[PDB]
């Protein structure tokens, strides 16, 4: 069937959009080639509409059905609980798009009677109606990039009332079933250090390791009604409260499978017959689907001893090599299978025999050295998009602080430490806003974070060695330096000098701000210290931090 049908109504913005990088007094201190940075807007939504619209055909064979039978057997061991309206409400972001029924996100979180009364009747309607398609809003994402211009990603999402109900019925399933079904292959269960650990141990576990990533063209569009149905049969394998089963079935038939698309102005835009990107189960269902197709494709291509790592639509496979040219032929057979399954490639997969050349979740493993000269593997990425985004956040306050999220995910990296930490801690000092909490996303879920808790969070996540890394690899140092040339970012030498200043200004304030100077910026001094564990770090509730993915999922912690 066609992934989408369109009436020709435009996808409309909910407010004023900017596409050129706003500039302020701080802008040039970070990035000077302002014209290489842009933000996607709703002005380009029509090209994405063309791009995500095509016919899917699926040919499902025994390898496909065998794997599914395996996954369901695992799924059968999962017990999930219904969440209460109250529990579901506190998972709602403070800033989540308001209902069309006279209440917003803060209404939800306060368990206000208007919100709770509406939520109860959506629930009841779900239990009493398994047919009537549920309405969705279609919007264009404003995301910041660097000239390669990409058209805007789209977001399709049901009303605030449906979204609370979704959590009641499926929050516990989507958090817990994926690890049980996919085991160590489920990606969102790992912190960045645990991901590096798994990749390395896996690579080492092969007699002759080969690895490749597989990038599907517009994954959401390739998801068919069969797929969304298949993943419901997985869910329904769980031990469930009868109200949960009924609601999951209802949400599957009415919403997950398909539904009408309405713009921010109230006009019908068309019909969806593929994955909606703004539903709770988006991440879990894409992960499951990508894992089923790929697993099944590993058998068609007779790839030997595969260890897959899947995060939504993002897939890396590490297997036993069969010889370079035979690996090349293998992957072509992998791709013909994936294609039959309705998941053809963007870029054709390539075999890699150097772990550090594999990109997965936009990231690669690299090596540096700790205080003792020990080799230590860490996760990193091309800093271009991080830097483009930080330029923007340098002038405009945004719903998500990518700089903050990147500091946490890439704390051990050359670029996060030397540039991101230096830049934004300088900004925060001048506004006296270190204790002001800021929203970032980690694995698609929203978190409110104090810049001041950074060294404690970084210690827990990556360990004290993130504050001591040095002697980075030549390829990593070159990729960073070269990105800086491209973007017009001061060279790493300038950052070091600025950081001695930021460090000094931080220690001057004493307390936690000083701990920030001490731990985050110890790399910037000759008279560097011994970094002992932070006392208050065990008091942090880092439970629930790397357990599941919830992108599109409207989840707050
Ligand atoms: C694997 C990590 C250790 C490093 C890279 N990284 N980084 C982040 C960051 C979050 N804030 C700053 S960076 C982050 O939130 C994610 C991340 N990974 C996803 C991957 C694939 C995804 O697929 C979406 C779908 N197809 O439905 C979704 C995500 S995510 O959960 O939004 N967040 C991520 O993978």
UniProtKB/Swiss-Prot annotation:
Record text on cofactor binding: Binds 2 magnesium ion that constitute a dinuclear catalytic metal center.
Cofactor(s) named in the record: Mg(2+)
Reactions performed catalytically: RNA(n) + a ribonucleoside 5'-triphosphate = RNA(n+1) + diphosphate
From-to range in the entire protein, with total length: 2420 to 2981 of 3010
Subunit organization: Homooligomer. Interacts with non-structural protein 5A. Interacts with host VAPB. Interacts with host PRK2/PKN2. Interacts with host HNRNPA1 and SEPT6; these interactions facilitate the viral replication. Part of the replication complex composed of NS2, NS3, NS4A, NS4B, NS5A and the RNA-directed RNA polymerase embedded in an ER-derived membranous web.
PTM per Swiss-Prot/TrEMBL: The N-terminus is phosphorylated by host PRK2/PKN2.
Residues recorded with modification Phosphoserine: 29, 42
Regulation: Activity is up-regulated by PRK2/PKN2-mediated phosphorylation.
Result of changing residue 278 to D/L/R: Complete loss of RdRp activity
Locations listed in the record: Host cytoplasm; Host endoplasmic reticulum membrane
Coiled-coil ranges (or none): none
Protein name listed in UniProt: RNA-directed RNA polymerase
Membrane topology annotation: Single-pass type IV membrane protein
Domain spans labelled RdRp catalytic: 209-327
Task performed by this protein: RNA-dependent RNA polymerase that performs primer-template recognition and RNA synthesis during viral replication. Initiates RNA transcription/replication at a flavin adenine dinucleotide (FAD), resulting in a 5'- FAD cap on viral RNAs. In this way, recognition of viral 5' RNA by host pattern recognition receptors can be bypassed, thereby evading activation of antiviral pathways.
Residue positions binding Mg(2+) 2: 215, 313-314
